[PDB]
Amino acid sequence: QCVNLTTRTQLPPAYTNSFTRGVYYPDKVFRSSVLHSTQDLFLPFFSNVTWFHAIHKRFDNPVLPFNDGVYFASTEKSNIIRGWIFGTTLDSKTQSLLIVNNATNVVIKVCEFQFCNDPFLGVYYRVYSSANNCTFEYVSQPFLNFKNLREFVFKNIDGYFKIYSKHTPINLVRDLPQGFSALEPLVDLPIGINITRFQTLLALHRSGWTAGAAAYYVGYLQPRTFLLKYNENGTITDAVDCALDPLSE
Amino acid sequence: SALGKLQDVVNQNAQALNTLVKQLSSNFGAISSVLNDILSRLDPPEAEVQIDRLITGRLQSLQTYVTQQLIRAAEIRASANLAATKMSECVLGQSKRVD
Amino acid sequence: QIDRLITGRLQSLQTYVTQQLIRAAEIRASANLAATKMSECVLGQSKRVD
Amino acid sequence: DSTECSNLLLQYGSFCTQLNRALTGIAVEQDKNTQEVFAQVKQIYKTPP
Amino acid sequence: DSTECSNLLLQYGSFCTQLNRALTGIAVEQDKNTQEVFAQVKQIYKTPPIKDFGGFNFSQILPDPSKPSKRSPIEDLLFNKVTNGLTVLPPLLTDEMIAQYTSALLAGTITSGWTFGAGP
Amino acid sequence: TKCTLKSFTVEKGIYQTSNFRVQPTESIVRFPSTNLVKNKCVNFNFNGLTGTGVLTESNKKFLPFQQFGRDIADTTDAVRDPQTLEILDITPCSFGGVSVITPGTNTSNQVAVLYQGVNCTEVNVFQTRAGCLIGAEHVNNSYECDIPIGAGICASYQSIIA
Ligand SMILES: *[C@@H]1O[C@H](CO)[C@@H](O[C@@H]2O[C@H](CO)[C@@H](O)[C@H](O)[C@H]2NC(C)=O)[C@H](O)[C@H]1NC(C)=O
Ligand SMILES: *[C@@H]1O[C@H](CO)[C@@H](O[C@@H]2O[C@H](CO)[C@@H](O)[C@H](O)[C@H]2NC(C)=O)[C@H](O)[C@H]1NC(C)=O
Ligand SMILES: *[C@@H]1O[C@H](CO)[C@@H](O)[C@H](O)[C@H]1NC(C)=O
Ligand SMILES: *[C@@H]1O[C@H](CO)[C@@H](O)[C@H](O)[C@H]1NC(C)=O
Ligand SMILES: *[C@@H]1O[C@H](CO)[C@@H](O)[C@H](O)[C@H]1NC(C)=O
Ligand SMILES: *[C@@H]1O[C@H](CO)[C@@H](O)[C@H](O)[C@H]1NC(C)=O
Ligand SMILES: *[C@@H]1O[C@H](CO)[C@@H](O)[C@H](O)[C@H]1NC(C)=O
């Protein structure tokens, strides 16, 4: 089932500063009291990160190019955001990856979904119409004023799709908090398919429809070197972007 | 920065040792920097070529390290000879040499 | 072919740096001697013969 | 300016850093030598007219 | 520990012996340098128990009896202010013996002037 | 020593002759698989990562996703056991130089062996900071240095004393 949503209010997407967010662990190696330089797909410090809102009437669900990697930031309360869609053409011609978290359990599927033009979930107070060739299924634990900061990094390297995640308790009302939080790697997924475009999934509220208050940020990864600092307990506490300014260089 | 002269020597020696150990992680054009990986992954006819590349790269690194150590040892020997001259002429006697 | 060029040029550069360091040591010794002559011959009268 | 040559050069490690560091040490050493030889007085004396 | 690597390495000759010889020469040279600089007297001189030097105070440079390392306050400050086939050989002269040599030189130059450096 | 110096007569002194590379005793393969042993120099195989080292208990608190551990010099010194969720330190197997302390062959043929940087419990046995010295009787008297051993220790012939 698909429904066209025709009650949106036109507004350009916003932009804001990334600050020192988007950092993740480059590998599975514990390091203690050392500084390590890595050349990986990273998000630049103080970069221009795209800002989308869900407020009531704004319901921001565009489809964005994946590029070389994606940083997703979520200033979320009440768990409106439920999952993501990855693929190339988002139809039955190609094979697409679906990540969902409904009210009970987390489902990961790789199928040829016939996606809706406007796919969404609904809570009372519809993502695809068909799935023909399903090659992989994976059921996992629940991943999930704005009260929760959910940071995710998605990469598609060597046919392996890496999901890095971090949850932060925050109390900032509108923008991103300023601080440092390293993203732990969560899921290493063996898909081996082409991904060039993605779309996030929101949840409607029914009492027409109402959009719950949520905000998300999309940033893109570029290949660069970071200098990571490891404390005595092996937790990444600081990082340096070697290409940002001459002092950090 | 009062004791910079000793600290520079300690830092240079530690940095040279650190670089020498870091040179082990370079493959020098071989498939891998680990000998065990080459022994487990390839037959001896190609393994001899891969270990030959690793041996020549590591030997060049070690020769470079030894040459740097010899030059630094010569500099420290000159400094020590100067220090012995100061010990003999300034502490064990009064020196008329200016400065 | 590029590997052969790289190893030859790298060997040449390492050799050049090695003689530069040896000459730097010799010039440093000469400069130390010159500083000693400046301190003892110009800024005072020296009793050292020759 | 060959990218392929630089990519192959990266396999050999930090040789380039070592050579640059050695040359930088020599370059600062020359300035130190000139300071030691000539900069032994902190007052610029002048002759009478 | 690769036997194949050692077998291939033996084809290159006595490079390893040369490098070991050079490092051994440097290692003995460091001990020779310390021996030349600090061991210039063969008599261990000691200061008198009463430090009556005509108003001159040498407490900051003489060894402290209260400290277990038997170092001077200046020497203690100096030691505080300095912070796969690889082995580090210990120096022949320990810090205590080098401190003892400096103490002997200080005692000689305080109680005897320059006479101890030229004879009795 | 005679073979090392290429002479049939050896002068008085300390001469470095060989290396004491402790040999691996067993082979341990761990997968998420034989039994795991500790406090011994063994050939370890942790999830396809092979090597030779002494496996001891570790005080490093690893994060749940991390499996390996590296030092400053990018060498794997810590590992997590796949079968049982525990952390182990890999200390490298004991190694050091083997030096022979002898007087002149004109005087005597007695020798002493110094294992550099090697504890005496895992090799007239005396423990010095330089290493383990076998064949020299330690005395409490102090004399002038005849053959330098290191860390303030010197050896002489009077038997060989240290
Ligand atoms: C919601 O709107 C989209 C876009 O207008 C609809 O997608 C169209 O579907 C028809 C098939 O019935 C195609 O011929 C058009 O080319 C599609 N347009 C685009 C831009 O792809 C979608 O079908 C609508 N949803 C429903 C339930 O009708
Ligand atoms: C020599 O100098 C030392 C330190 O400069 C003097 O020691 C001080 O003595 C006074 C009075 O007893 C104490 O209050 C200070 O704390 C001491 N300082 C230190 C660093 O110990 C010493 O009295 C002087 N005279 C003699 C004869 O030794
Ligand atoms: C971010 O990009 C928008 C247009 O895409 C631009 O108007 C804005 O000034 C940019 N912000 C920064 C900080 O570069
Ligand atoms: C959540 O999705 C899974 C996957 O189809 C489904 O089995 C489960 O019943 C869903 N939860 C609810 C409450 O319907
Ligand atoms: C994918 O599905 C279509 C129709 O459902 C089928 O014709 C096609 O053979 C399938 N491809 C594979 C690789 O299973
Ligand atoms: C992946 O998809 C994009 C867009 O459809 C296409 O340009 C690219 O060639 C694809 N890559 C592969 C390896 O098929
Ligand atoms: C590291 O962990 C210890 C407890 O194991 C804690 O006391 C210490 O504060 C931690 N370090 C940091 C920088 O938080």
Side-chain angles (χ1 to χ4, degrees):
Chain A
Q1 290 186 343
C2 302
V3 153
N4 302 113
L5 298 183
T6 62
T7 62
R8 276 187 197 90
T9 300
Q10 281 72 240
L11 191 68
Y15 300 88
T16 181
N17 221 26
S18 172
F19 292 116
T20 59
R21 306 213 83 83
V23 60
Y24 57 93
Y25 285 80
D27 49 336
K28 299 291 182 64
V29 175
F30 180 91
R31 280 172 191 91
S32 83
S33 318
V34 297
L35 275 77
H36 195 252
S37 181
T38 54
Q39 163 60 259
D40 279 18
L41 270 301
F42 279 122
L43 176 73
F45 280 175
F46 308 108
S47 71
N48 211 13
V49 58
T50 316
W51 190 358
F52 299 95
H53 295 81
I55 197 68
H56 191 186
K57 198 133 180 193
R58 292 295 296 164
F59 181 75
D60 289 332
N61 258 0
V63 182
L64 272 306
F66 194 76
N67 296 335
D68 294 19
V70 160
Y71 163 72
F72 179 89
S74 177
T75 56
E76 187 61 46
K77 49 157 182 167
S78 69
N79 309 295
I80 307 301
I81 297 172
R82 303 307 270 274
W84 307 267
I85 295 307
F86 305 96
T88 45
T89 66
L90 301 192
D91 42 33
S92 59
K93 283 164 196 68
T94 61
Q95 193 171 186
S96 297
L97 164 65
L98 180 147
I99 306 297
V100 291
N101 178 21
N102 57 4
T104 57
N105 201 352
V106 163
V107 178
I108 293 90
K109 290 191 315 184
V110 176
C111 299
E112 296 177 318
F113 304 96
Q114 271 289 107
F115 281 120
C116 293
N117 180 74
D118 212 324
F120 40 79
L121 273 296
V123 172
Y124 196 93
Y125 261 96
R126 292 182 183 175
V127 173
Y128 51 92
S129 55
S130 80
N132 282 352
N133 304 329
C134 292
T135 51
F136 182 76
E137 292 85 4
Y138 181 76
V139 160
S140 188
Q141 293 84 14
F143 294 159
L144 306 180
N145 196 1
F146 293 139
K147 277 302 203 62
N148 303 290
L149 179 62
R150 290 180 173 93
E151 295 166 285
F152 293 86
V153 161
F154 310 129
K155 296 201 295 185
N156 192 54
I157 307 297
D158 304 306
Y160 267 107
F161 182 96
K162 270 81 68 176
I163 306 185
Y164 306 86
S165 187
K166 182 62 184 295
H167 295 282
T168 298
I170 59 168
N171 49 342
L172 205 147
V173 185
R174 187 176 172 89
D175 213 0
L176 279 172
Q178 182 176 2
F180 201 94
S181 64
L183 266 71
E184 299 168 69
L186 182 61
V187 173
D188 192 0
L189 187 64
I191 49 158
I193 63 169
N194 190 4
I195 291 165
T196 52
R197 215 177 48 248
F198 66 100
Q199 174 267 359
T200 187
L201 307 164
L202 289 174
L204 304 183
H205 283 331
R206 303 271 189 174
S207 67
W209 57 272
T210 316
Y216 65 93
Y217 305 84
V218 170
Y220 303 113
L221 303 182
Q222 285 84 18
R224 56 185 58 247
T225 59
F226 281 178
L227 172 63
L228 277 302
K229 182 172 71 69
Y230 288 77
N231 65 338
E232 67 268 16
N233 295 316
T235 303
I236 292 178
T237 57
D238 280 322
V240 156
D241 187 8
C242 312
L244 169 69
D245 42 347
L247 179 58
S248 309
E249 197 149 331
Chain B
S1 58
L3 282 180
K5 299 185 65 43
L6 313 178
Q7 194 65 63
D8 289 345
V9 176
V10 170
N11 288 356
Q12 280 183 292
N13 285 309
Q15 179 190 232
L17 279 178
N18 194 356
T19 306
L20 179 71
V21 190
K22 288 291 181 63
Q23 282 296 99
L24 287 177
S25 72
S26 288
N27 47 41
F28 306 105
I31 63 169
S32 185
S33 58
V34 181
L35 289 177
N36 266 325
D37 276 12
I38 294 166
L39 265 302
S40 62
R41 279 165 56 176
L42 288 181
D43 37 8
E46 278 72 45
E48 287 204 351
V49 178
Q50 305 302 307
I51 312 174
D52 182 274
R53 298 275 282 165
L54 275 182
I55 281 178
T56 187
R58 290 167 181 191
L59 185 85
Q60 193 182 158
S61 304
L62 195 49
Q63 260 172 5
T64 293
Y65 164 74
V66 165
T67 300
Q68 296 301 109
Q69 281 298 137
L70 281 164
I71 297 164
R72 291 175 180 174
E75 185 169 22
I76 294 299
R77 182 186 58 247
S79 184
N81 288 343
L82 179 60
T85 311
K86 300 240 177 185
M87 186 73 75
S88 300
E89 294 183 30
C90 313
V91 175
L92 263 65
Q94 181 176 31
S95 185
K96 279 294 218 312
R97 296 172 62 194
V98 176
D99 303 332
Chain C
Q1 305 299 305
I2 289 166
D3 174 70
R4 297 275 283 165
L5 274 185
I6 283 176
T7 185
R9 290 166 179 191
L10 182 81
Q11 177 167 242
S12 302
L13 196 49
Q14 287 184 356
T15 295
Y16 164 74
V17 164
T18 300
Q19 274 99 16
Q20 277 297 321
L21 279 164
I22 297 165
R23 288 174 182 176
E26 176 178 6
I27 293 298
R28 183 186 58 246
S30 185
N32 287 343
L33 180 61
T36 311
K37 300 238 177 184
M38 177 87 49
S39 298
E40 295 183 31
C41 313
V42 173
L43 263 66
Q45 183 177 32
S46 186
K47 277 294 221 315
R48 294 172 61 194
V49 178
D50 302 332
Chain D
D1 55 326
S2 166
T3 65
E4 297 92 2
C5 186
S6 48
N7 290 343
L8 291 177
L9 185 53
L10 284 179
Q11 309 297 140
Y12 290 106
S14 60
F15 276 136
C16 284
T17 308
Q18 266 184 335
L19 300 171
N20 296 353
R21 183 185 296 131
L23 288 181
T24 302
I26 294 176
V28 304
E29 189 160 66
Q30 301 322 294
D31 288 326
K32 184 192 191 338
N33 284 346
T34 315
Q35 291 294 112
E36 281 202 17
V37 166
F38 292 104
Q40 287 184 0
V41 282
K42 61 181 181 295
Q43 297 291 322
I44 304 302
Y45 301 110
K46 301 217 56 180
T47 58
Chain E
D1 56 324
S2 162
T3 186
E4 297 92 3
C5 186
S6 50
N7 287 344
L8 291 175
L9 185 54
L10 284 178
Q11 310 300 321
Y12 290 103
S14 61
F15 277 133
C16 283
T17 308
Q18 279 206 77
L19 301 170
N20 294 354
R21 184 185 298 128
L23 289 183
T24 304
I26 294 176
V28 304
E29 189 159 65
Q30 301 323 295
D31 288 326
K32 183 192 190 336
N33 284 346
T34 311
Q35 171 83 234
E36 281 211 24
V37 167
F38 293 104
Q40 295 207 5
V41 284
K42 59 180 173 287
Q43 307 257 324
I44 304 302
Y45 300 110
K46 292 295 181 180
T47 57
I50 305 302
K51 304 290 185 291
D52 182 22
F53 301 117
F56 289 86
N57 192 314
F58 303 108
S59 62
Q60 304 318 107
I61 60 177
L62 282 179
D64 204 335
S66 74
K67 294 177 181 179
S69 64
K70 300 297 185 292
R71 270 193 298 266
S72 85
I74 286 169
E75 281 176 329
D76 207 291
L77 198 146
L78 293 168
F79 276 88
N80 288 132
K81 283 210 73 65
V82 172
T83 58
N84 49 6
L86 271 74
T87 58
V88 165
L89 299 172
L92 176 59
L93 288 174
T94 68
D95 296 325
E96 293 85 4
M97 278 182 311
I98 299 166
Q100 184 157 233
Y101 269 135
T102 58
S103 78
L105 293 162
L106 281 155
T109 190
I110 283 162
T111 62
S112 76
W114 58 79
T115 68
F116 80 108
Chain F
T1 315
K2 288 173 175 175
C3 189
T4 304
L5 305 173
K6 303 294 186 294
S7 181
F8 269 65
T9 58
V10 178
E11 299 294 325
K12 180 177 61 169
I14 172 170
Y15 298 92
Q16 182 175 1
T17 60
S18 65
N19 296 293
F20 180 52
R21 300 182 58 186
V22 154
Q23 296 303 309
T25 61
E26 310 174 13
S27 161
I28 300 306
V29 176
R30 305 288 280 168
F31 263 97
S33 187
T34 188
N35 195 3
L36 175 75
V37 300
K38 285 172 284 189
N39 323 319
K40 293 200 61 194
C41 168
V42 289
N43 281 354
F44 61 94
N45 197 326
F46 282 93
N47 301 352
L49 180 63
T50 181
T52 301
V54 177
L55 317 175
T56 59
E57 270 164 301
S58 178
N59 287 287
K60 307 182 178 192
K61 294 299 180 291
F62 276 24
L63 298 181
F65 64 96
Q66 271 158 331
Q67 294 300 110
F68 291 163
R70 288 182 194 276
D71 59 337
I72 295 100
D74 294 330
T75 62
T76 77
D77 56 334
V79 67
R80 167 178 284 174
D81 183 74
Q83 289 284 319
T84 57
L85 271 299
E86 59 172 16
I87 312 300
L88 302 177
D89 287 331
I90 300 103
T91 61
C93 291
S94 299
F95 73 103
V98 168
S99 288
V100 177
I101 294 92
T102 178
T105 68
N106 177 222
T107 293
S108 175
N109 285 5
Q110 296 187 259
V111 294
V113 186
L114 177 67
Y115 296 91
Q116 293 155 3
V118 159
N119 202 320
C120 282
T121 76
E122 58 97 20
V123 61
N124 272 2
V125 172
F126 179 46
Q127 176 69 61
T128 64
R129 289 196 155 200
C132 191
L133 180 53
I134 308 190
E137 168 71 41
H138 177 236
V139 293
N140 298 302
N141 200 1
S142 281
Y143 309 99
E144 188 204 352
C145 192
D146 189 20
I147 304 166
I149 308 302
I153 308 298
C154 292
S156 186
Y157 189 66
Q158 62 97 27
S159 61
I160 294 171
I161 57 161

